[PDB]
Amino acid sequence: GHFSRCPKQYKHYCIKGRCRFVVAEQTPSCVCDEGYIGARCERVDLFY
Amino acid sequence: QSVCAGTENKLSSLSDLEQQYRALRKYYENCEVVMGNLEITSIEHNRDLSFLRSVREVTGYVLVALNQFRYLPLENLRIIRGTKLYEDRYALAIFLNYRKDGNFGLQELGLKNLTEILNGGVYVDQNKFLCYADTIHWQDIVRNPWPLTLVSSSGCGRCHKSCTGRCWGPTENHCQTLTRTVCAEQCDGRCYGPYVSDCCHRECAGGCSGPKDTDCFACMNFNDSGACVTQCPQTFVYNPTTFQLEHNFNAKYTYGAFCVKKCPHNFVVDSSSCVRACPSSKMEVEENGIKMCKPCTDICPKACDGIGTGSLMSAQTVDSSNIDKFINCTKINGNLIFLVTGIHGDPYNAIEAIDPEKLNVFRTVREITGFLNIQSWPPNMTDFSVFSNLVTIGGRVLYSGLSLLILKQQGITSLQFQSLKEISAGNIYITDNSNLCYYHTINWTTLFSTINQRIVIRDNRKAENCTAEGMVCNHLCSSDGCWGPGPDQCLSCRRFSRGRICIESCNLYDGEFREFENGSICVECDPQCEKMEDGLLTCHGPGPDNCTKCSHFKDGPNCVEKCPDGLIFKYADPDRECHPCHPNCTQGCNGPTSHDCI
Amino acid sequence: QVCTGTDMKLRLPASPETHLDMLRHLYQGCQVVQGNLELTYLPTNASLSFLQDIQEVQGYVLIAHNQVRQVPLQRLRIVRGTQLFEDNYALAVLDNGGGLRELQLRSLTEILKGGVLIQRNPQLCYQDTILWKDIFHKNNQLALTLIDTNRSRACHPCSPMCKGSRCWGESSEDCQSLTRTVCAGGCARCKGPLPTDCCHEQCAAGCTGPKHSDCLACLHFNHSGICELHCPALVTYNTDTFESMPNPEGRYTFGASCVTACPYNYLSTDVGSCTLVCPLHNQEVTAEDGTQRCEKCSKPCARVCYGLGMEHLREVRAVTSANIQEFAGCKKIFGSLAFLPESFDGDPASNTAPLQPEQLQVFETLEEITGYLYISAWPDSLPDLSVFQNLQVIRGRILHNGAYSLTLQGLGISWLGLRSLRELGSGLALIHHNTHLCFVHTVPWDQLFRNPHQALLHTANRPEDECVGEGLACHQLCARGHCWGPGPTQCVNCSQFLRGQECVEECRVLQGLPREYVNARHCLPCHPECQPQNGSVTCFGPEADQCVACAHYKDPPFCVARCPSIWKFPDEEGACQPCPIN
């Protein structure tokens, strides 16, 4: 795909989610655990 | 006008792809105007996106990334205002929409009515299966050129032989119509043809149907009832013939993107505009139930920065570093939020956790102009001992539709707010509080400002379970507002109360202190007078003139323990009353006559 | 530069001898005329070259009863016509007859509003020639256009090279250039017959190019050389965050144009404009030296003392015994003052008495007039204007006959007085026929004026050498010879000291009379208890603390008349000590 493992400086980038690093745009992102939203998964989902 | 809010997630998404699609529908389905960003990401070729066809406008940026579907049904999107940009550079960004190890991805963009971007750049870059990414006159779309606009399928053909490199699709209905680069030399705006006679108005955006400020497919500045205008009708009009300022008869409030005849009740009316707070040079006042503001000629109270306002624009939460700014505050200008990162610190940043004792800086706050979002709290803070004197919240800024949001608070058993009487506007959402007992004892239509406000309660501690074998309401508290254990946690009591404390009876005829009473409130009387026995009232009101018996002399209408002699002298007898002294009594007095002077 | 007009229609000049000097000072070097432009009763061979600079007139243009052959207005491009002659006309040429020969309005290209009219000019050729409908404005079309071809001179064809025979005069350069009726497009003005010759929506009078920066005249407001709909507001409203904040680009609106700040005599308002009147529920506040602004009242505003031309006094002729009491104890008057024949005489028709010298005392507290002071009658028992001796500032916001802030006509004055006056904010000063005043020549007029286009005009006042020929002249102690009148009390500025109102040579420190302490220009007695010794601190100062020497009963911090009864008594040195008996 377009992403791989997060570099060491991102060990704590994401909270309550799975950290991934996008290679094509050289940019970190996270896949949030159920019920969490936000760029770092730092908030709960009001529609859940 | 079908206004909806954006998701604001950037590249991040949910682990469940089906919920991610259902959420995309829940946010944008049948919407026309998007507040903040329009984010369309990670949707598979097996899911329909036709519910996005009604979107006309976006205030933030439009982001499309990492999808697998062939076509974007964004045909009615006319204008992107660019009030927030992707990576602080781009207003439109469409990239990586394909599978690396397959034949799926975005092929056509749609956008037949997309005419302009007011701010920010354009990002396209890599899109393996996307036709017509190039051959677009982006200078007719961008209002502020930057001599950004990065483009990288090929051999897809042309829209039509008649469309001279002005194409984003395979047919004559995909041809770019130029409105800025094909105009008369005299035009300040955009045109509906290549002549000085078919150019349109200066405030109009996104193309035009005629030369009038009414005839326009979008507006810059304000909407005045269908006219695009630089400014709403003002309370005065300047007369350049006489150098005089004359009063207007058709003036309106400048309010958000609009001109209106009736300002929102919760907002400050300044003289011709409606605002979330008055500027620091003026003092907020109220007259005849109207919230307004006047020049700061007196010693003026100041409100403190909330989360997302003032010096805290970059803050998501109260945290161990910005909590120190709330120490002497009685009013917060902006929102009050506690996220996981604020409370338990953020190891990605230099921010630490908050010590529960540091929360005491908020014990002096009575008003919060924004919303209360509480998603984390320290493990042993079982009630809101901080904010117990909070009087009112919200009215001007809401979180989606909410003014009070409480999610998943496991350490909480009671709320215990004593002074919180009213919510200015917005709904309430309280769920997953598995140990919270007193949440069902509140009559919420007593706290709401209007009959249109609602509350949702689910998944908290079972009310019947707690009532039977847990905690119950105080015998002296009414059915409306029993927030916790004891007579001091009740908002409305039967019989009597003294400030925050509810009581069965008052000290009118007994106790080392005596009171007078009204229908439910009792207050102490002047102690210099005598205490009555045998069930008899000691005082009719707050003073020596009300006391029903006096152990000392009087002075006119009231009981006095010590007479103000030596003023001029004015002696007193011990049994009845104070009396003026003989005119010669300048150095002591024993009475009213000539031999009484010392 | 910027200049104003008289708005007097066809009335006779108040002082014909100064009529050309008035016009030369008001107009020489200005580009824009605010209000009406009136050029009337000019003598044969008048030197009018100072008018060649006028480009734009806000009111009407009136040329009447002149004996001049030509008037140099060839640069005049636009008339706004916001005021109309007889409520009808933006241009009027009347009775100029040996008289006006040619109009010579080469560059005239716009009438926005109101008619043209021409009548009874026997020497004026080519009335008939101009195509007025090209000069008119499309959206108004108010071309009343009454004309009078009954001239006594024979007209020559206007030019061998003017295809339409439409001209401003007898020269080949007088041919009218058309700017509306000759072009293919629907534009109100254009630079040529082609569809690409349209210049802009906001431009007027034609153009040098297709942009709002190219306009030869401009609708709405000129901002800084570009033509614009409104001047940018001082405060901008944020539509996304719902808050109001100062505008980094914010500007003041000023008549025809948009500016960073307003002129000295204009009152700033927070809405983004400058006015001559303060909006309702606002105070005039001198927040910084040299300026003034309006500020909102937090509670109901205090009584405003109005003068003539304002509120209930708008239709009042002059101050009379029926209205003099309205000014009793006022320090600032909102409006003007006028003292005319039938102010100090009677008016039996309305049962109104004449003003008396005692009634004039209502102005003793007056410091500022927000208008003009016009006096054409005064009592013979008053040799001066001492009833206004405390007047400090005349603003000139309202001018007599549109030009004068201070006017004195034929009074029985022997000297001006008014020693408190220090500023004439705006407007001209006219002093004439005043048969016994003379100190007008010693007044420091150059210290009172505040703007260019501002001057004294005078005639028929008693001649200086005939009057100072009696030794009636300014006092030697003061002000390099500048005085308001006779003696050391009529001085402008004392070279040594001022005692009360009198300039004095000596500060009376060590003389036989009650001894005085020194001040930067003043002199004042010791406190009565301070002993009049010959030493310069002993007796002397503004406070008890300087009076170290005591005449009797010295209390250690200060000399007192008696030792206070704790009881005190005088000791062997005359100082107060505590008594053995209290």
Ligand SMILES: *[C@@H]1O[C@H](CO)[C@@H](O[C@@H]2O[C@H](CO)[C@@H](O[C@@H]3O[C@H](CO[C@H]4O[C@H](CO)[C@@H](O)[C@H](O)[C@@H]4O)[C@@H](O)[C@H](O[C@H]4O[C@H](CO)[C@@H](O)[C@H](O)[C@@H]4O)[C@@H]3O)[C@H](O)[C@H]2NC(C)=O)[C@H](O)[C@H]1NC(C)=O
């Ligand atoms: C709001 O922000 C302020 C800063 O602006 C913070 O700082 C001060 O905090 C103190 C304590 O809360 C405030 O109250 C007073 O503190 C005194 C402490 O002693 C010092 O100051 C005195 C001043 O005279 C000096 O003499 C002394 O040497 C010390 O340097 C107390 O003395 C005061 O009360 C006691 O003394 C008086 C004496 O007359 C008695 O009458 C009282 O009964 C009592 O015994 C008083 O408590 C102080 O005013 C703040 N200073 C300023 C400049 O504002 C605050 O802490 C912060 N508030 C909160 C709620 O966090």
Ligand SMILES: *[C@@H]1O[C@H](CO)[C@@H](O[C@@H]2O[C@H](CO)[C@@H](O[C@@H]3O[C@H](CO)[C@@H](O)[C@H](O[C@H]4O[C@H](CO)[C@@H](O)[C@H](O)[C@@H]4O)[C@@H]3O)[C@H](O)[C@H]2NC(C)=O)[C@H](O)[C@H]1NC(C)=O
């Ligand atoms: C997206 O693009 C389309 C064009 O590609 C653009 O056009 C709109 O089309 C609809 C119908 O398809 C127009 O709807 C109008 O409906 C009213 C009644 O509800 C009719 O009376 C109108 O008839 C006439 O007048 C219109 C003048 O606005 C003409 O457009 C029309 O041809 C008729 O002569 C008409 O059917 C709609 O008005 C137009 N848009 C406009 C304002 O011209 C559509 O607006 C684009 N969507 C966006 C982004 O707004």
Ligand SMILES: *[C@@H]1O[C@H](CO)[C@@H](O[C@@H]2O[C@H](CO)[C@@H](O[C@@H]3O[C@H](CO[C@H]4O[C@H](CO)[C@@H](O)[C@H](O)[C@@H]4O)[C@@H](O)[C@H](O)[C@@H]3O)[C@H](O)[C@H]2NC(C)=O)[C@H](O)[C@H]1NC(C)=O
């Ligand atoms: C002692 O207790 C009294 C009650 O037992 C207190 O009440 C009374 O207070 C009023 C006002 O100070 C005193 O004066 C007169 O009251 C009458 C009644 O009008 C009342 O209602 C109108 C309408 O709302 C209101 O405006 C008034 O303020 C009153 O509340 C007036 O008509 C008179 O003009 C005048 O104000 C009463 O005399 C007084 N009652 C007693 C003591 O007789 C009283 O204030 C308490 N005293 C103290 C120490 O506060």
Ligand SMILES: *[C@@H]1O[C@H](CO)[C@@H](O[C@@H]2O[C@H](CO)[C@@H](O[C@@H]3O[C@H](CO)[C@@H](O)[C@H](O)[C@@H]3O)[C@H](O)[C@H]2NC(C)=O)[C@H](O)[C@H]1NC(C)=O
């Ligand atoms: C300026 O503001 C006015 C309102 O003051 C706008 O007019 C209104 O625009 C809304 C847009 O949603 C129209 O609502 C639509 O109504 C139809 C009804 O059939 C519905 O099917 C749509 O879903 C939608 O809700 C509304 O009718 C319209 N009102 C009128 C009288 O035209 C106007 O569009 C604004 N102009 C600009 C340029 O923003």
Ligand SMILES: *[C@@H]1O[C@H](CO)[C@@H](O[C@@H]2O[C@H](CO)[C@@H](O[C@@H]3O[C@H](CO)[C@@H](O)[C@H](O)[C@@H]3O)[C@H](O)[C@H]2NC(C)=O)[C@H](O)[C@H]1NC(C)=O
């Ligand atoms: C919960 O609070 C609501 C108010 O938010 C209470 O409803 C209100 O009840 C009062 C008292 O009955 C109503 O006022 C008057 O009631 C009489 C009948 O008792 C009627 O004749 C009058 O015309 C008048 O309606 C009031 O209208 C009503 N408010 C609403 C919005 O319906 C409610 O009683 C509270 N519940 C408890 C258990 O305390």
Ligand SMILES: *[C@@H]1O[C@H](CO)[C@@H](O[C@@H]2O[C@H](CO)[C@@H](O[C@@H]3O[C@H](CO)[C@@H](O)[C@H](O)[C@@H]3O)[C@H](O)[C@H]2NC(C)=O)[C@H](O)[C@H]1NC(C)=O
């Ligand atoms: C017994 O009842 C009387 C009223 O009949 C109580 O006095 C009243 O107290 C209220 C506040 O609870 C006062 O209301 C507000 O007062 C401020 C004063 O600045 C004013 O700005 C507000 O507009 C509003 O009026 C009310 O004025 C006051 N009434 C009088 C006549 O003074 C009294 O406190 C009660 N006693 C007990 C023991 O509860």
Ligand SMILES: *[C@@H]1O[C@H](CO)[C@@H](O[C@@H]2O[C@H](CO)[C@@H](O[C@@H]3O[C@H](CO)[C@@H](O)[C@H](O)[C@@H]3O)[C@H](O)[C@H]2NC(C)=O)[C@H](O)[C@H]1NC(C)=O
């Ligand atoms: C907007 O108003 C400005 C003035 O505020 C107009 O610009 C002015 O144009 C005049 C000529 O029409 C300039 O005067 C001339 O300057 C040269 C300098 O060498 C001199 O040789 C001439 O004798 C004459 O004095 C004047 O300097 C100029 N002012 C500025 C500030 O540049 C402008 O034309 C107006 N725009 C519109 C659209 O009406």
Ligand SMILES: *[C@@H]1O[C@H](CO)[C@@H](O[C@@H]2O[C@H](CO)[C@@H](O[C@@H]3O[C@H](CO)[C@@H](O)[C@H](O)[C@@H]3O)[C@H](O)[C@H]2NC(C)=O)[C@H](O)[C@H]1NC(C)=O
């Ligand atoms: C007339 O009015 C002026 C102000 O308009 C008076 O003020 C100033 O006074 C001083 C003293 O006479 C003049 O001279 C300077 O004095 C200082 C004293 O310490 C000395 O250090 C300097 O070397 C110089 O001699 C000053 O020039 C003058 N300023 C102005 C603006 O003229 C003046 O006293 C009045 N004169 C008369 C003749 O009444």
Ligand SMILES: *[C@@H]1O[C@H](CO)[C@@H](O[C@@H]2O[C@H](CO)[C@@H](O)[C@H](O)[C@H]2NC(C)=O)[C@H](O)[C@H]1NC(C)=O
């Ligand atoms: C120009 O002079 C002519 C006469 O030479 C005036 O026209 C006459 O006006 C009178 C007005 O009472 C009529 O009775 C005549 O019938 C007119 N004569 C003709 C031949 O039509 C004219 O009024 C003068 N123009 C102006 C503007 O005063």
Ligand SMILES: *[C@@H]1O[C@H](CO)[C@@H](O[C@@H]2O[C@H](CO)[C@@H](O)[C@H](O)[C@H]2NC(C)=O)[C@H](O)[C@H]1NC(C)=O
């Ligand atoms: C200080 O002033 C005093 C007057 O206040 C002078 O004293 C007087 O001197 C004359 C000399 O002929 C005597 O006749 C008076 O009787 C004195 N008056 C008093 C009150 O004693 C004294 O000379 C002055 N000193 C100086 C140095 O001039």
Ligand SMILES: *[C@@H]1O[C@H](CO)[C@@H](O)[C@H](O)[C@H]1NC(C)=O
């Ligand atoms: C209460 O939580 C705080 C959080 O900082 C912690 O330091 C403390 O140990 C906790 N107390 C108990 C009794 O667990």
Ligand SMILES: *[C@@H]1O[C@H](CO)[C@@H](O)[C@H](O)[C@H]1NC(C)=O
């Ligand atoms: C109340 O809640 C507790 C939770 O452990 C449960 O065990 C108990 O059976 C409940 N009691 C009643 C009366 O439902």
Ligand SMILES: *[C@@H]1O[C@H](CO)[C@@H](O)[C@H](O)[C@H]1NC(C)=O
């Ligand atoms: C005007 O100047 C001419 C020049 O020839 C002269 O004849 C005439 O007398 C002058 N008029 C006046 C009033 O001086």
